[PDB]
Design a protein around this ligand. Structure first.
Ligand code: CLA
Ligand code: CLA
Ligand code: CLA
Ligand code: CLA
Ligand SMILES: CC(C)=CCC/C(C)=C/CC/C(C)=C/CC/C(C)=C/CC/C(C)=C/CC/C(C)=C/CC/C(C)=C/CC/C(C)=C/CC/C(C)=C/CC1=CC(=O)C(C)=C(C)C1=O
Ligand SMILES: CC(C)=CCC/C(C)=C\CC/C(C)=C\CC/C(C)=C\CC/C(C)=C\CC/C(C)=C\CC/C(C)=C\CC/C(C)=C\CC/C(C)=C\CC1=CC(=O)C(C)=C(C)C1=O
Ligand SMILES: CCCCCCCCCCCCCCCCCC(=O)OC[C@H](CO[C@@H]1O[C@H](CO)[C@H](O)[C@H](O)[C@H]1O)OC(=O)CCCCCCCCCCCCCCCCC
Ligand SMILES: CCCCCCCCCCCCCCCCCC(=O)OC[C@H](CO[C@@H]1O[C@H](CO)[C@H](O)[C@H](O)[C@H]1O)OC(=O)CCCCCCCCCCCCCCCCC
Ligand SMILES: CCCCCCCCCCCCCCCCCC(=O)OC[C@H](CO[C@@H]1O[C@H](CO)[C@H](O)[C@H](O)[C@H]1O)OC(=O)CCCCCCCCCCCCCCCCC
Ligand SMILES: CCCCCCCCCCCCCCCC(=O)OC[C@H](CO[C@@H]1O[C@H](CS(=O)(=O)O)[C@@H](O)[C@H](O)[C@H]1O)OC(=O)CCCCCCCCCCCCCCC
Ligand SMILES: CCCCCCCCCCCCCCCC(=O)OC[C@H](COP(=O)(O)OC[C@@H](O)CO)OC(=O)CCCCCCCCCCCCCCC
Ligand SMILES: [Ca+2]
Ligand SMILES: [Cl-]
Lengths: 97, 176, 102, 335, 153, 243, 51, 137, 51, 51
C-alpha cells in the first residue's frame, strides 16, 4: 500500500535520536563539540550497521573517539532512507531559521 | 488598521476573485478614467476667448456659448478611439452612473461576505488539482498564498482564540 | 555546505535542477536557485572561479580564497533592499540595520 | 499623379479618414495587430509555461483547463531572465511556447504601439487645430503599463517577474508584490488610490452636479437627454445654479464657478495621482519599498508592543513564506 | 444522534460559498449515522483535544492539546524537525457510542484521518454516492434567506 | 584555447570536446600504475521515448522527440578512478561531477516527457585483457536514477513527501481512497544502462572520444503516474591520466 | 440526520412553522405515520396557490 | 515592566560569578551591536549560516562555553567553530583581524564587554523572539 | 482501432483526401512521426479559412 | 488487427439511430484490442458457427 516513508520514519529510532544514517548534519549542533569536524566525518563516512561503528571512523583522534563515546546515547541507526539522503539533503535540506 | 482589513479579505475571503468586487474596481478605476479623460478633452478643445496663454481668465461665469468645442471633441475621439460622445447630457449622466454603480456592486459582494458566502473557489479546478498533481494555474497559486496569510496572521490577529501554531505545522515553501 | 562535506557538482535541489550549480540556456555552468536570472553577472571577486565554460568545478572545489568568502558574505548581507524610512532588508525584516544601498 | 509618395503622405495624414491612421499609426496599427492576434491565440490555445525556470509549467490557457477568471498568458521563463527571446531564438515553436515566448512578443509590441497611440493622440490634435496635452493625460495609464510590464522586470532582473496577462495572474502579481515590498505602506501607492478614489469621487461629483442643473427643454414623459442637440451654441446646463447649490453644500469659496478651472482639476487630480502610483512600482522596482515600522513601539523593559503595522507584517510573511514554493534554495530572497 | 449532529461545522451556515450551489448534501454528502465520539490519547494515556475549526477558516491545521491547552501532538508540515508528529507521540483514538462504539485505532494514518475529521466537531458517516457530492461545504437555507434579504433590503 | 567570453551565448559550452580525424591511435595501460578519468563528458544528441503499445500489446519502439528545454542537456566534469582489473580489463568508477541534468522533451501528441538524464554512480567496464585502449573499446555498466523531484518538492496544492499537506485540503469532506495515489508521495529509485563505445583514441595525450547510448526511466512525478522508458544517444569525451 | 434544511428546502419550512406538517401520501415532517393532515397538506397549500 | 538591574545581571565567567551591567552599557552595547553585528546577526540569528544563533543555550553548548561575558569577549578577539577545533578569524570579524574588518578597529575592550552583555541581556527581555527568525517576528 | 471515423470526425476526413494529413504538433493521420507537414497542416487549413 | 476490425457490425453505418448522437465511441466504447477469433465446438468436437 502507499505510505509516506518519512512520516513512517518518525515512528522509529529516527525521530527520537540523531540517526547516523539519515538525520541531517545540522542535528549535531545540539550536543557539545560534535558539529563542525565530527558531524562532517560521521555523515561523510557512509552508513553504519550499529551506533558503535562510528567509533571506527579512520583517523579519529583519541579525543574525538572520547567525545563520540559520551554522546552515543543520543544516536541510533536505521535503514538508509533514499527520500532523506538523496539530493545531498543531509548537508542542506532547505531549512534555515 | 485598514490595510490589514484588505489583506484579511484576500487571505480569508479571496475577495479579489469575487465578481462583485471586480465590478467595483471596474467602476472606480473606470470612473477615475472618465474624470481624467473628460477633463483633458475639455481643456484641450477650448475656444479662444482671450488674448493670454493662461486661458483660465478667459471664461464666462455667466453662461452663453459653450466654452469648449463639443463638435471638435466628437471628431477627435471618433478618429482615435472609434467611439465618441455627442450629447453632454448623456456624457455627464454616464459620469454619475459608472462610479456609483461600481460602489453599489462592491457593497453587495461584502454583504455576502458577512455570511461568509464568498467567491473563494472554483470547484472544477479543485477536483482536477486533487486527482492530477501537475495541473497548475495562477488560481491554485493564489490559494496557497491565502493559506500562508491565514496561518501566519491568525495568531496575533485573533487573540481571543488563543491560537498556538507549532513551527512544524506552519506551511512554508523551500528555504523561505 | 561544501565545507560540511557536500559535493556541489552533483547536488540535486527540490525541483531536480541543481541546488548549487546548474546550466544556463546556452550550456554554461552557473549558480543555482532563483539566481539563475543573474548568470550575466561578472565581478572581480567571482571571476577567478570562472573557467572557459563558466564556473569551474575544480577551482570551486579548492581555489576559493578567504577574501572571496568574506566578500561574498559582505555583499550578501548588503543587497540593495530597503525601506523608505531606511530599514535594510526585506519588507518583513525587523528594525536594527539602518541602511539602503546608494 | 501629383507624386505617389507625396500622395501617400497626404492620405496617411488625411483628417478625412474614419480612423486617423497617423504617422505614429503606421507603427501603431501593425504592432497592435501582432500583439492582439498573438494574445488571443495564446490565451485560448497556448500550452503550459515554465515561468519560474524550475521546470514546473503553469498552464494558463482556456483549452488547457482554464476559464476567463483564472486563465492568463504566462510570463517568459526565469531561465531567460532579461534576455531577448524572439521566435527565431528557439530550436522550435514547441520550445518557444514552453519558455513563455509569446509573453515577450506581446508585451513588447503592446508597449510599443501603446506609446505610438499616445503619439497619435497628439498628431490628430495637431491636424485638427486643437490644443495638445490630451496625450499627456494618457501618459499616466501608459506609464503604468510600462512600470508593470517593463520597468519592474528590468529592475528585478527578469521578465518572469512582470505582471501576467490575466485576471488571477494579476492578483498574483499584487499579493506577492505586497509581500516583498509592502506597497500599502508606501506614499506613492497611497497617492495612487487617492487619485483613483478621488477620480471616481469627482467623476461622480461633476457628473451629478451638471446633470442635476440642466435647463428644462424636455417633456415630463420624454428623455431629458433629447434636450440637447449635437452642435449647440449655448450651454445645456446652468453652471451658475450648479455652483449655487454646491457652494451651499460646503461653503462658497470651496466651490468652482469657472468651468475651465473645474475641468483642469478634474483632469489634473487623477493623472497626477496615477503618475505617482506608476512611479511607485517603478521605484520599488529597485527595492526602495514602503515604510517598515516593524517592532517600532517597544515598552520600558524592551518588550515589543505590536501595532497594526505588525499585524500587516504577519500577513506579509505568509505570502512571502508561501509564494514560489520550490523556487528558493537559500535564506534571503534577493530576486 | 440528532443532538450530536448539531455539533458539526458542516451545518454551520457560515461555511460555504456564493457559487457553491445546491443543498448541503451536495457538499459533505447525505448524513447516514454518527460514527461516535472520538477520544484521542497519547502513549502516556493523557487525553488530547482537537482544536476546532473557526468558521472563518476554509482550511485549518490539526493540533492536539491537553486540558491545560499545552500542545502535545499535531500533524506537521515540514517533517525535518517535527516534535509532535502522531508517530512520535503514539497517538491513538477510541470511540464511544455510535457506529465505531467500543473500537480503538492505533495505526498513525487511520488515527490522523479521524483527527483530521474531529476538527469539524462530531464525526459522521456520509453517503457521497447518491448526489455525487464533491466534499465542499454549502450553506443552509437560513444562510441563503439571510443573504438574499440583506441584499434586496 | 578560447576564454569564457569566446564561448558565452554560442552554445559551445554545452558541447563535449572533440578529437580530430587524425587521432585514431591507442593509449597504453601499465596495469601496475593506477589510472583515473580526469574528465568524462556526455553530450546528448537524441532522446527517444518508447511508446506505450496501448492495450493491444504489439511490441513497442522508441520514437524521436523534440527538446522542449534548451541546450542544458550535457553532463560534464565527471571524474573517478579507472582501476585495472585482474583479468586485464578496465572499470571506471565515478566519484563526483555534473553527473545529471533535468531534460524535458515533447512528443507527437504534445505530451511533455521530463526525465533526469544522469549517470550517477557509474560503473562502466570493458573487455577482459585490454593492454591498450583502441578505437571502439566498449565501456558498459549501470548507474542510478534517483527521483526526478527531490523530497522537498510540493505539488500545486501544497502536498509533498518530506514536507507539505497531508491530503486534498480543498475538498474537506471528500472520500480519500480515490485520492490516495496523489496524496501519498513516493520517492522512486532505479537503475540505468549505458555503453560508451570509443571511436577516436590519442595515446599521445591520453584522451579518448566516441559515442554513447543509455536507457533509463523518466519522471514518475512523485509516483503519481507510470514512468516512460527513454533511450538517449549522443557523444562523449574522456581524459585519461596516470595520477 | 436528513431534515429539510439539509436538502436545500426553502419554502417547505415556512409551511411547517404555521401548521402544515403532513403530506397526502402519508408521511409527516416530525416523522410520524398514520396521521391524516386533511386537505391542508403541503400538496394542498401548493394546490391552493396555483388556483 | 522595566529594565531593572535585576534583568541586567548576567553571568561573567564559567565559575558562576556574575556581573551587573548598567543602562548606559546596555544601550551602548545595543548601539555597537548594530554597528558591527546586525548586518549578519539581526535579531539573534545568523544570515550567512542560519544553523548557529545567539541563543544563550546555543552559546552554552558551544566549545568553549560562550554564554558569559568572558566567553563572548574572547570570541570577539579570536573566533572559533562550534567545537573550537578551528580558528575562523579570517572570515569572521575579530580584533586579530581588524585590518580585514575595519569596523572592528575602533572597538576597544570596553566596547567588547558591552556587545557581549547585550547578547546575554536581549534573550532575557525578548525571549523566544531573540533566537528564532521570521516565525516570531 | 481508433481512427477519425470512430471519433465522429466530419471535416477532418475531407482534409486528408486532398493531402493535409499532419498536425503542427507532430502527429499524422497515417500514424507516422518526425514528419514535417509544413504550413498546410490541419491547423493551417483551419487558420486560413478563419482569415 | 485493423483488418479484423472492419469485420465488426459496430462499424456498419446501417446500425444506429436518428437521435443516437455523438461519435461511434459513445456507443460500444473506444476499441482497445482484438480479443481474437472465436471458434465454437460441441461435445462431439464438431465446429459450430454463429449466425
Ligand atoms: C485595482 C485595485 C482595486 C480597486 C480599484 C479597488 C476598489 C475598491 N475596493 Mg478594493 N481591494 C483591492 C484592490 C482594489 N480595490 C485589493 C487587492 C484588496 C485586497 C483583497 C481589496 C480589498 C477590498 C476590501 C476588503 C474592500 C474593498 C472595497 C473597495 C471599494 C470601496 C472603496 C471606497 O470607495 O471607499 C469609500 C469609503 C466609505 C466608507 C464612504 C463613506 C466615507 C465618508 C463619506 C468620508 C467622510 C470623510 C470625512 C469628512 C473626513 C474626515 C477624515 C479626516 C482624516 C480628514 C472600491 C470599489 C470595499 C468595498 O467593496 O465595500 C463596499 C471593501 O470593503 N477592497
Ligand atoms: C470610514 C470611511 C473612510 C475614510 C474616512 C477613509 C479615509 C481615508 N482613506 Mg480609506 N478606506 C475605507 C474607508 C475610509 N477611508 C475603506 C472601507 C477601505 C477599504 C477597506 C479603504 C481603503 C483605503 C486605502 C487602500 C487607502 C485609503 C486611504 C485613505 C486616506 C486618503 C484617501 C483619499 O485620498 O481619498 C480620496 C478622496 C478625496 C479626494 C476627499 C478628500 C477629503 C479628505 C478626507 C480631507 C477632508 C477635509 C477635512 C475634513 C478637514 C476640513 C476642515 C476644514 C474645512 C477647516 C483617507 C484618510 C489611503 C491612505 O492610506 O493614504 C494615507 C489609501 O491608500 N483607504
Ligand atoms: C431570494 C429567494 C430565494 C432563496 C433564498 C432561495 C434559496 C435557495 N434555493 Mg431557490 N429559487 C428562488 C428563490 C430563492 N431561492 C426562485 C425565485 C426560484 C425560481 C427560479 C428558485 C428556484 C430554485 C431551484 C430550482 C432550486 C433552488 C434551490 C435553492 C437552495 C439552494 C441554494 C442555491 O442554489 O443558491 C444559488 C445562488 C446563486 C447562484 C446566486 C445568484 C446571484 C446572481 C448570480 C447575481 C446576479 C448579479 C447581476 C447579474 C449583476 C448585474 C447588475 C449590474 C448590471 C448593475 C436555496 C435554499 C435548489 C434546491 O432545491 O436545493 C436542493 C434548487 O434546486 N431554488
Ligand atoms: C449537415 C452537415 C453535418 C453533418 C453530416 C454532421 C455530422 C456530424 N456531426 Mg456535426 N455539425 C454541423 C454539420 C454537420 N455535422 C454544423 C453546421 C455544426 C455547427 C453547429 C456541427 C457541429 C457539431 C458538433 C459540435 C459536433 C458534431 C458532431 C457530429 C458527428 C456526430 C453526429 C451527430 O451528432 O448527429 C446529430 C444529428 C441530429 C441530432 C439530427 C438533427 C435533426 C433535427 C432534429 C431535425 C429538425 C427538424 C425540424 C425542426 C422540423 C421543422 C420543419 C417543419 C416546421 C416544416 C457527425 C459526424 C459531433 C462530433 O464531434 O462527434 C464526436 C459533435 O460534437 N457536429
Ligand atoms: C480569448 C478571450 C476570451 C479573451 C479574454 C480576455 C479577457 C480576460 C477579458 C475579460 C474582460 C472581462 C470579462 C472584464 C470584466 C470587467 C467588467 C465587465 C466589469 C462589470 C462592469 C459592470 C456592469 C459594473 C458596474 C460598474 C460600471 C458601470 C463601470 C463601467 C465602466 C465603463 C464602461 C467606463 C467606460 C470608460 C471609457 C473608456 C469610455 C470612454 C468614453 C469616451 C471615448 C469619452 C471621450 C470624450 C471625452 C469628452 O470630454 C467629450 C466632450 C467627448 C465628446 C468624448 O468623446
Ligand atoms: C452649524 C453650527 C451649529 C456650528 C457647528 C459647526 C461644526 C462643529 C461643524 C463641523 C462639521 C465637521 C466635523 C466637518 C464636516 C467635514 C467637511 C468640512 C466636509 C469636507 C469638505 C471638503 C473640505 C471637501 C471639498 C472637496 C473639494 C475640493 C470640492 C470638490 C469639487 C468638485 C471637483 C466638484 C465638481 C464641480 C464643482 C462645482 O462647483 C461645479 C459648479 C460643478 C459644475 C462641478 O462639476
Ligand atoms: C483603435 C480603435 C480601438 C477600438 C476601441 C473599441 C471601443 C469599443 C466600443 C464599444 C461600443 C460603445 C457604444 O456602444 O456606445 C456608443 C456611445 C456613443 O454614442 C452615444 O450616443 C448618444 C447616447 O444616447 C450620445 O449622443 C452620446 O454622447 C454618444 O454619442 O458611447 C457612449 O456614449 C458611452 C461611452 C463608453 C463607451 C464604452 C467604452 C468601451 C469599453 C469596452 C470594454 C469591453 C472590453 C471587453 C473585452 C472582451
Ligand atoms: C444586482 C443585484 C444582484 C443580487 C443577486 C441576489 C441573489 C440572491 C440569492 C438568491 C439565491 C436563490 C437562487 C435561485 C436559483 C437556484 O437556486 O438555482 C441553483 C442552480 C441549481 O442548483 C442545483 O442544486 C442541486 C439540484 O437540485 C444540485 O446540487 C445541482 O448540482 C445544482 O447545484 O444552480 C445553478 O445553476 C446556479 C446558476 C445561477 C445563475 C443564474 C443564471 C441566470 C438565468 C436567467 C434566466 C432568466 C429567464 C427569464
Ligand atoms: C425540415 C428539415 C429538417 C431536416 C434536418 C436535417 C439534419 C441533417 C442531420 C445533420 C446532423 C448534424 C448535426 C449537427 C449538430 C450536432 O452534431 O450535435 C450533436 C449533439 C452533441 O453530440 C454529442 O456528441 C458527443 C460529444 O462530442 C457525445 O457523444 C455527447 O453525448 C453528444 O452525443 O447532440 C445533441 O445535443 C443533439 C441535439 C440536436 C437538436 C438541435 C437543437 C436545435 C438548436 C438550435 C440552436 C439555434 C441557435 C441559433
Ligand atoms: C505586414 C504588412 C501587412 C499589410 C496589410 C495589407 C495592407 C492593409 C490592408 C487593410 C485591409 C483592411 C481594411 C480595413 C478597413 C478599415 O479599417 O476602415 C476603412 C477606413 C476608411 O479608409 C479609407 O478607405 C478609402 C476606401 S473606401 O472608403 O474603403 O472605399 C480609401 O480611399 C482611403 O485611403 C482610406 O483611408 O479606414 C480608415 O479610416 C483608415 C484607418 C485604418 C486603421 C487600421 C486599423 C487600426 C487598428 C489599430 C489597432 C487595433 C488592434 C486590434 C483591435 C481589434
Ligand atoms: C513633481 C510633481 C510634478 C507635478 C506636475 C503637475 C502637472 C500639472 C497637471 C498636468 C495635467 C495634464 C492633463 C491635461 C490638463 C490640461 O490640459 O490643462 C492645462 C493647464 C494650463 O492650460 P493653459 O490654457 O493655462 O495653458 C497655456 C499656458 O499654460 C502656457 O502653456 O495646466 C495648468 O494649469 C498648468 C499648471 C502649472 C502649475 C504647476
Ligand atoms: Ca504516452
Ligand atoms: Cl506564487
Amino acid at each position: 500500500e502507499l505510505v509516506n516513508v518519512v512520516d513512517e520514519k518518525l515512528g522509529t529510532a529516527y525521530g527520537e535520536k540523531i540517526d547516523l544514517n539519515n538525520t541531517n548534519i545540522a542535528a549535531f549542533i545540539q550536543y557539545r563539540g560534535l558539529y563542525p569536524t565530527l558531524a562532517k566525518l560521521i555523515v561523510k563516512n557512509a552508513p553504519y550497521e550499529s551506533v558503535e561503528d562510528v567509533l571506527n571512523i579512520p583517523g579519529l583522534t583519541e579525543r574525538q573517539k572520547q567525545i563520540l563515546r559520551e554522546n552515543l546515547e543520543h544516536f541510533t541507526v536505521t535503514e538508509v532512507e533514499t527520500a532523506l539522503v538523496e539530493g545531498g539533503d543531509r548537508y542542506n535540506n532547505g531549512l534555515y531559521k | 488598521a485598514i490595510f490589514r482589513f484588505l489583506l484579511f479579505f484576500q487571505g480569508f475571503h479571496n475577495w479579489t476573485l469575487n465578481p462583485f468586487h471586480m465590478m467595483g474596481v471596474a467602476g472606480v478605476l473606470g470612473g477615475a478614467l472618465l474624470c481624467a479623460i473628460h477633463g483633458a478633452t475639455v481643456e484641450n478643445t477650448l475656444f479662444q476667448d482671450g488674448e493670454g496663454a493662461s486661458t483660465f481668465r478667459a471664461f464666462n461665469p455667466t453662461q452663453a456659448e459653450e466654452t469648449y468645442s463639443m463638435v471638435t471633441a466628437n471628431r477627435f475621439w471618433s478618429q482615435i478611439f472609434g467611439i465618441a460622445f455627442s450629447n453632454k447630457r448623456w456624457l455627464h449622466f454616464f459620469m454619475l452612473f459608472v462610479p456609483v454603480t461600481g460602489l453599489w456592486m462592491s457593497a453587495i459582494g461584502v454583504v455576502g461576505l458577512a455570511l461568509n458566502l464568498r467567491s473563494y473557489d472554483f470547484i472544477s479546478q479543485e477536483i482536477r488539482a486533487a486527482e492530477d498533481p501537475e495541473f497548475e494555474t495562477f488560481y491554485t497559486k493564489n490559494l496557497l498564498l491565502n493559506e500562508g496569510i491565514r496561518a501566519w496572521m491568525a495568531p496575533q490577529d485573533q487573540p481571543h482564540e488563543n491560537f498556538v501554531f507549532p513551527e512544524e505545522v506552519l506551511p512554508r515553501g523551500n528555504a523561505l | 555546505d561544501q565545507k560540511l562535506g557536500a559535493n556541489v557538482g552533483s547536488a540535486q535541489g527540490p525541483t531536480g535542477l541543481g541546488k548549487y550549480l546548474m546550466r544556463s540556456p546556452t550550456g554554461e555552468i552557473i549558480f543555482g536557485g532563483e539566481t539563475m536570472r543573474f548568470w550575466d553577472f561578472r565581478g572581480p571577486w567571482l571571476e577567478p572561479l570562472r573557467g572557459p565554460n563558466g564556473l569551474d568545478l575544480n577551482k570551486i572545489k579548492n581555489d576559493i580564497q578567504p577574501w572571496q568568502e568574506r566578500r561574498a558574505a559582505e555583499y550578501m548581507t548588503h543587497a540593495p533592499l530597503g525601506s523608505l524610512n531606511s530599514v535594510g532588508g526585506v519588507a518583513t525584516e525587523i528594525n536594527s540595520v539602518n541602511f539602503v544601498s546608494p | 499623379s501629383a507624386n505617389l509618395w507625396e500622395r501617400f503622405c497626404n492620405w496617411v495624414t488625411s483628417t478625412d479618414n474614419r480612423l486617423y491612421v497617423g504617422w505614429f499609426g503606421v507603427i501603431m496599427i501593425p504592432t497592435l495587430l501582432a500583439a492582439t492576434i498573438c494574445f488571443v491565440i495564446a490565451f485560448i490555445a497556448a500550452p503550459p509555461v515554465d515561468i519560474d525556470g524550475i521546470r514546473e509549467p503553469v498552464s494558463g490557457s482556456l483549452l488547457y483547463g482554464n476559464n476567463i477568471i483564472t486563465g492568463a498568458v504566462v510570463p517568459s521563463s526565469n531561465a531567460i531572465g532579461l534576455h531577448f527571446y524572439p521566435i527565431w531564438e528557439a530550436a522550435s515553436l514547441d520550445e518557444w511556447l514552453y519558455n513563455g515566448g509569446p509573453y515577450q512578443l506581446i508585451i513588447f509590441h503592446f508597449l510599443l504601439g501603446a506609446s505610438c497611440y499616445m503619439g497619435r493622440q497628439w498628431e490628430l490634435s495637431y491636424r485638427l487645430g486643437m490644443r495638445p496635452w490630451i496625450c499627456v493625460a494618457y501618459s499616466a495609464p501608459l506609464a503604468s503599463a510600462f512600470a508593470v510590464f517593463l520597468i519592474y522586470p528590468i529592475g528585478q532582473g527578469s521578465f518572469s517577474d512582470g505582471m501576467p496577462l490575466g485576471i488571477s495572474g494579476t492578483f498574483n502579481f499584487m499579493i506577492v508584490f505586497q509581500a516583498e515590498h509592502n506597497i500599502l505602506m508606501h506614499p506613492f501607492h497611497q497617492l495612487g488610490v487617492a487619485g483613483v478614489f478621488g477620480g471616481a469621487l469627482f467623476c461622480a461629483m461633476h457628473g451629478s452636479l451638471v446633470t442635476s442643473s440642466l435647463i428644462r427643454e424636455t417633456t415630463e414623459t420624454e428623455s431629458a437627454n433629447y434636450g440637447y442637440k449635437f452642435g449647440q451654441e449655448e450651454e445645456t446646463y446652468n453652471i451658475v445654479a450648479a455652483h449655487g447649490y454646491f457652494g451651499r453644500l460646503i461653503f462658497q469659496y470651496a466651490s468652482f464657478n469657472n468651468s475651465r478651472s473645474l475641468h483642469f482639476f478634474l483632469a489634473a487630480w487623477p493623472v497626477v495621482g496615477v503618475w505617482f502610483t506608476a512611479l511607485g512600482i517603478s521605484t520599488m522596482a529597485f527595492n526602495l519599498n514602503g515604510f517598515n515600522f516593524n517592532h517600532s513601539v517597544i515598552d520600558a523593559k524592551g518588550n515589543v508592543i505590536n501595532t497594526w503595522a505588525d499585524i500587516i507584517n504577519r500577513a506579509n510573511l505568509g505570502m512571502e513564506v508561501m509564494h514560489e514554493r520550490n523556487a528558493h534554495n537559500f535564506p534571503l530572497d534577493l530576486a | 444522534e440528532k443532538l450530536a449532529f448539531y455539533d458539526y461545522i458542516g451545518n454551520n451556515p457560515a461555511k460555504g460559498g456564493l457559487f457553491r450551489t445546491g443543498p448541503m448534501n451536495k457538499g459533505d454528502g447525505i448524513a447516514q449515522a454518527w460514527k461516535g465520539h472520538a477520544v484521542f490519547r497519547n502513549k502516556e494515556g493523557e487525553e488530547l483535544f482537537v482544536r476546532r475549526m473557526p468558521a472563518f477558516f476554509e482550511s485549518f491545521p490539526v493540533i492536539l492539546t491537553d486540558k491545560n491547552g499545552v500542545v502535545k501532538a499535531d500533524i506537521p508540515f515540514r517533517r525535518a524537525e517535527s516534535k509532535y508528529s502522531f508517530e512520535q507521540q503514539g497517538v491513538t483514538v477510541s470511540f464511544y457510542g455510535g457506529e465505531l462504539n467500543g473500537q480503538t485505532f492505533t495505526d498513525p494514518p487511520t488515527v490522523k484521518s479521524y483527527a483530521r475529521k474531529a476538527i469539524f466537531g462530531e464525526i459522521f458517516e456520509f453517503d457521497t454516492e447518491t448526489l455525487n457530492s464533491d466534499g465542499i461545504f454549502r450553506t443552509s437555507p437560513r444562510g441563503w434567506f439571510t443573504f438574499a434579504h440583506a441584499v434586496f433590503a | 584555447t578560447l576564454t569564457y567570453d569566446d564561448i558565452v551565448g554560442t552554445g559551445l559550452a554545452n558541447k563535449c570536446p572533440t578529437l580530430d580525424d587524425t587521432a585514431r591511435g591507442a593509449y597504453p595501460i601499465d596495469s601496475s600504475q593506477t589510472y583515473r578519468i580526469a574528465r568524462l563528458c556526455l553530450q546528448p544528441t537524441t532522446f527517444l521515448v518508447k511508446e506505450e503499445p496501448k492495450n493491444k500489446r504489439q511490441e513497442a519502439e522508441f520514437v524521436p522527440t523534440k527538446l522542449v528545454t534548451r541546450e542544458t542537456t550535457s553532463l560534464d566534469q565527471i571524474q573517478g578512478e579507472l582501476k585495472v582489473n585482474s583479468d586485464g580489463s578496465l572499470t571506471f568508477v565515478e566519484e563526483d561531477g555534473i553527473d545529471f541534468q533535468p531534460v524535458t522533451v515533447q512528443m507527437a501528441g504534445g505530451e511533455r516527457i521530463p526525465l533526469l538524464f544522469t549517470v550517477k554512480n557509474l560503473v562502466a567496464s570493458t573487455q577482459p585483457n585490454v593492454t591498450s585502449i583502441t578505437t571502439s573499446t566498449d565501456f558498459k555498466g549501470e548507474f542510478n536514477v534517483p527521483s526526478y523531484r527531490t523530497a522537498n518538492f510540493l505539488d500545486p496544492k501544497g502536498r509533498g513527501l518530506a514536507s507539505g499537506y497531508d491530503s486534498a485540503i480543498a475538498l474537506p469532506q471528500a472520500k480519500e481512497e480515490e485520492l490516495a495515489r496523489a496524496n501519498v508521495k513516493r520517492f522512486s529509485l532505479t537503475k540505468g544502462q549505458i555503453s560508451l563505445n570509443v571511436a577516436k583514441v590519442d595515446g599521445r595525450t591520453g584522451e579518448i572520444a566516441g559515442t554513447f547510448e543509455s536507457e533509463q526511466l523518466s519522471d514518475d512525478d512523485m509516483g503519481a503516474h507510470e514512468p516512460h522508458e527513454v533511450k538517449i544517444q549522443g557523444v562523449f569525451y574522456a581524459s585519461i591520466e596516470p595520477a | 440526520l436528513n431534515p429539510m434544511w439539509r436538502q436545500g428546502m426553502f419554502v417547505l419550512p415556512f409551511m411547517a412553522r404555521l401548521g402544515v406538517t403532513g403530506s397526502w401520501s402519508g408521511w409527516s415532517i416530525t416523522g410520524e405515520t398514520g396521521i391524516d393532515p386533511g386537505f391542508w397538506s403541503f400538496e394542498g397549500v401548493a394546490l391552493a396557490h396555483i388556483v | 515592566a522595566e529594565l531593572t538591574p535585576e534583568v541586567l545581571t548576567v553571568p561573567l565567567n564559567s565559575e558562576g560569578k556574575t556581573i551587573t551591567l548598567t543602562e548606559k552599557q546596555y544601550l551602548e552595547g545595543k548601539r555597537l551591536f548594530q554597528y558591527a553585528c546586525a548586518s549578519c546577526h539581526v535579531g539573534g540569528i545568523t544570515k550567512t549560516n542560519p544553523s548557529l544563533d545567539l541563543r544563550t543555550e546555543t552559546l552554552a553548548l558551544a566549545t568553549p562555553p560562550r554564554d558569559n561575558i568572558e566567553g563572548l569577549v574572547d570570541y570577539m578577539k579570536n573566533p572559533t567553530t562550534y567545537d573550537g577545533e578551528q580558528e575562523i578569524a579570517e572570515v569572521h570579524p575579530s580584533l586579530r583581524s581588524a585590518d580585514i574588518f575595519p569596523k572592528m578597529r575602533n572597538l576597544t575592550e570596553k566596547d567588547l564587554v558591552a556587545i557581549a552583555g547585550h547578547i546575554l541581556v536581549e534573550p532575557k527581555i525578548l525571549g523566544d523572539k531573540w533566537g528564532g527568525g521570521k516565525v516570531y517576528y
